[PDB]
């Protein structure tokens, strides 16, 4: 069975902060374990803030501080993104837009909603407007906490995707 790779596209306002953060985080882990080609992780922003830009200076420092890659080119929520197998929304609105645009809740999932320590349903994720050292590492924690949930999802889905 020639099962094509997964497609996790994270949707946040800007696509230069939280989205690219998890992008390099668990996706790097994927290829590090041998699943980098088995799952296509991507990202997009509903408001195309820094579309065409690169990862935000704050997140770049965060990732690089922990040894994570930081290269990425921001994209807007488009067709190819809506075609993803998993749209990791960072907020109730982003998720809503994607699904109404052509996606569905089967594909669209909240980033913190993968977090095993979440407890309650996460239909909305925080956002650090204060802009301190805490704000940056905080988001990193959000994502790293979801990676054990995002992993399982992409893994389980990519597994069942193709048969023998």
Curated annotation (Swiss-Prot):
CDD domains to which the protein is assigned, alphabetical: LMWPTP
Catalyzed reactions per annotation: O-phospho-L-tyrosyl-[protein] + H2O = L-tyrosyl-[protein] + phosphate
Domain of life: Bacteria
Active site: 12, 18, 127
Record-linked SUPFAM superfamilies: Phosphotyrosine protein phosphatases I
One term of GO molecular function: protein tyrosine phosphatase activity
Documented EC number(s): 3.1.3.48
UniProt KW keywords: Hydrolase, Protein phosphatase, Virulence
Enzyme class: hydrolase
Hydrolase found in the keyword field: yes
Family stated for the protein in its record: Belongs to the low molecular weight phosphotyrosine protein phosphatase family.
Protein's job: Key virulence factor required for mycobacterial survival within host macrophages. Exhibits protein tyrosine phosphatase activity. Supports mycobacteria survival during infection by modulation of the phagosome maturation and modulation of the normal host signaling pathways, including host innate immune responses and cell apoptosis.
Protein name: Low molecular weight protein-tyrosine phosphatase A
Organism field: Mycobacterium tuberculosis (strain CDC 1551 / Oshkosh)
């Amino acid at each position: 069975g020639m099962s094509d790779p997964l497609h996790v596209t994270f949707v946040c306002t800007g696509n230069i902060c939280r989205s690219p953060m998890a992008e390099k985080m668990f996706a790097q882990q994927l290829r590090h374990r041998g699943l980098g080609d088995a799952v296509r992780v991507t990202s997009a922003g509903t408001g195309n803030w820094h579309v065409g830009s690169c990862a935000d200076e704050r997140a770049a420092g965060v990732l690089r501080a922990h040894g994570y890659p930081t290269d990425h080119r921001a994209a807007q929520v488009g067709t190819e993104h809506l075609a993803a197998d998993l749209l990791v929304a960072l907020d109730r609105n982003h998720a809503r837009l994607l699904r109404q645009l052509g996606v569905e809740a089967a594909r669209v999932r909240m980033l913190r909603s993968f977090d095993p320590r979440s407890g309650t349903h996460a239909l909305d994720v925080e956002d650090p407007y204060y802009g301190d050292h805490s704000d940056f590492e905080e988001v990193f924690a959000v994502i790293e906490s979801a990676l054990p949930g995002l992993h399982d999802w992409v893994d389980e889905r990519l597994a069942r995707n193709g048969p023998s």
